[PDB]
């Protein structure tokens with residue numbers, strides 16, 4: 099840490115804490131994530147290092163990955179504000195639709211990019227999406243779950259957010275697909291539109307049942323194979339699907355159809371990032387500038 103000055107902590111992720119820091123040597127302002135260890139799986143270290151080669155306008159740049167003193171540091175470029183803070187700051191007025199559309203479009207471009215390189219994020223949430231004054235938005239903190247394993251108890255006893263978890267993960271699937279990122283993004287899109295989280299579960303079963311209460315308890319008809327999933331129980335209550343116009347009312351029909359495709363239960367039917375970019379919703383997409391208070 100002697101190389102940096104921790105201006106201020108800026109967040110605690112499921113895999114570690116992130117600080118805004120200044121490189122005393124170069125004066126560069128960066129985001130430093132310190133990972134919570136014994137020997138530190140060198141296997142992860144190699145995979146994480148691979149991520150340093152991801153170069154995309156909508157992906158936060160990973161500058162360095164350092165293993166030293168039983169701790170792993172990730173040095174990232176620093177962006178102005180995260181989406182969680184921006185949504186909170188825009189709570190009274192709401193984010194303008196053109197800007198929500200712009201952000202969703204850019205996020206899908208970023209996902210289309212990483213997914214074509216066989217990289218999954220796995221834990222997308224508003225705090226992992228960063229924005230700048232120029233109107234860009236970027237995905238931050240990929241992998242980790244690919245190099246490590248699905249968390250449960252952070253070194254700080256952090257309250258892991260389950261709100262954006264795809265149903266196949268909640269039902270114990272062992273092999274995640276790129277579709278889990280589309281689900282998370284769908285949840286975030288709904289939240290930007292309504293100004294309320296879509297599925298705010300406080301436990302895994304509560305998370306699952308909130309999804310079921312809105313989209314209907316899945317069955318073999320809509321999701322072949324669901325009844326044989328690891329954590330599926332025949333005793334799950336059977337809720338009928340709610341009319342979808344109640345889900346994200348401020349949204350026009352193009353927006354609702356796209357969201358419905360991002361929230362399909364069956365990972366195989368759920369729209370891909372590439373197909374989503376072609377959806378009619380983006381026919382009139384533009385790149386507005388947000389009003390940011392830093």
Ligand SMILES: COc1ccc2c(c1)/C(=C/c1cnc[nH]1)C(=O)N2
Nearest residue numbers: 129174175176177178179180238239
């Ligand atoms: C979650 O992991 C990361 C990774 C890289 C990052 C930030 C967060 C991050 C967060 C942030 C929050 N408010 C301003 N920046 C930043 O600037 N760069």
